Write a protein that binds this ligand. Structure first.
Ligand code: HEM
Ligand code: HEM
Ligand SMILES: [C-]#N
Ligand SMILES: [C-]#N
Lengths: 191, 192
């Protein structure tokens, strides 16, 4: 198993539904063309995940105010926390590429938002760490997530056109997800 | 000659986020002095194309009833006065993003723009009757179509793909940065 990974088995139903999802996909310009290319992105990234995770960890770890969110109260990084999240983040790369974007997917998107937010942060791994990840950084991270993926998307010999389409699909899907993850952060009724 | 409703540098509130917050947020979006240079270049490329850009942007918003919704009168039809007034301020925002120093005045206006999408100030600037709040989910979503809209225009002055990529990436970073700041009035106090 992947510890803490509970896709399909969340305690809550998401507060957004399939119509909300359709409308949000429209807002990020996501179509059947992106369904095709996000799946291809999975195929390309799957065997590169260790290097992708090393790069992502390098980014977070190089900024004290970001590594902060994985620290124990004494200010030192909690390596068990980092390692447990790494395994779930690795799986998220595959889920983004392979899962149907349906009710189960929406339920887990609500869960991931809850886990960055004070509602559930630190509970999954039973760690003691900072209580909340400020929302400002969830939005900001859309950029470095896409920048991290981009070079890896070129490494299986796909055409420049195909690489660009995979990258754009990844950007749309990341944006879509972060928008959903805002739910527990947003003043009730303003989402 | 004054753009109605455009109050850059003269807003009523100091932003709740400061220049140190901004430094740290720039780090999170990988925005550096290099991007300052490339966003200025993007400005130079985009400036004389703004009418086409605005038509393209309006076309996207107008293409989906649930998006055009945010500019509608109670009868469900677009408020053309509202669209036209916002268009002029959006045109200016393209230039500001490219040309202003991201300093305290800039931060203060980012708080203002957030407040104007939010129920706090929406519809007050133009004194219109429209929908009370733009759901935050769409502000985040729109990071994508903003970048997709700018991309082809960034290539229309003969720059190489490598140069267009640097301008595009700078625009993407700067748009993300701004939407992150605009979340402030939407986010539960203490969670931003
Ligand atoms: C585009 C934005 C982001 C993406 C795509 C992302 C991705 C993920 C994923 C896939 C997980 C595991 C979800 C699961 O439990 O199955 C996770 C958890 C986590 N992320 Fe992020 N993340 C983002 C923003 C952030 C930011 C800004 C930080 C600040 C460093 C951060 C730090 C963490 C932490 C500390 C956890 C563990 C939360 C917990 O205690 O459950 N993430 N993230
Ligand atoms: C990346 C996201 C967005 C960007 C860059 C953007 C840009 C802008 C700008 C520059 C303005 C004028 C600011 C000023 O008053 O000086 C504005 C206002 C406005 N925008 Fe957006 N916008 C975004 C998201 C959205 C969304 C999702 C909608 C929904 C259709 C929307 C609809 C509106 C409306 C209705 C106004 C007028 C608000 C008021 O009553 O003052 N915007 N936007
Ligand atoms: C999150 N990493
Ligand atoms: C906003 N348009």
């Amino acid at each position: 198993k992947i510890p803490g990974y509970t896709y399909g088995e969340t305690e809550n139903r998401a507060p957004f539904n399939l119509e909300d999802l359709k409308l949000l996909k429209e807002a990020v310009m996501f179509t059947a063309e992106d369904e095709e290319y996000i799946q291809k992105a999975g195929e390309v990234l799957e065997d590169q995940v260790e290097e992708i995770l090393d790069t992502w960890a390098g980014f977070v770890g190089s900024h004290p105010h970001l590594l902060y969110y994985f620290t124990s109260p004494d200010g030192t990084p909690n390596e068990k926390y980092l390692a447990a999240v790494r395994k779930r983040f690795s799986r998220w790369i595959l889920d983004t590429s392979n899962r149907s974007y349906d009710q189960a997917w929406l339920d887990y998107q609500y869960e991931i938002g809850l886990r960055h937010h004070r509602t559930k942060k630190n509970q999954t791994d039973n760690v003691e760490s900072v209580p909340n990840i400020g929302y400002r950084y969830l939005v900001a991270f859309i950029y470095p997530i896409t920048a991290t993926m981009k070079p890896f998307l070129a490494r299986k010999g796909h055409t420049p056109e195909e690489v660009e389409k995979m990258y754009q699909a990844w950007f749309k899907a990341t944006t879509l997800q972060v928008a959903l993850w805002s739910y527990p952060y947003v003043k009730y009724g303003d989402f």
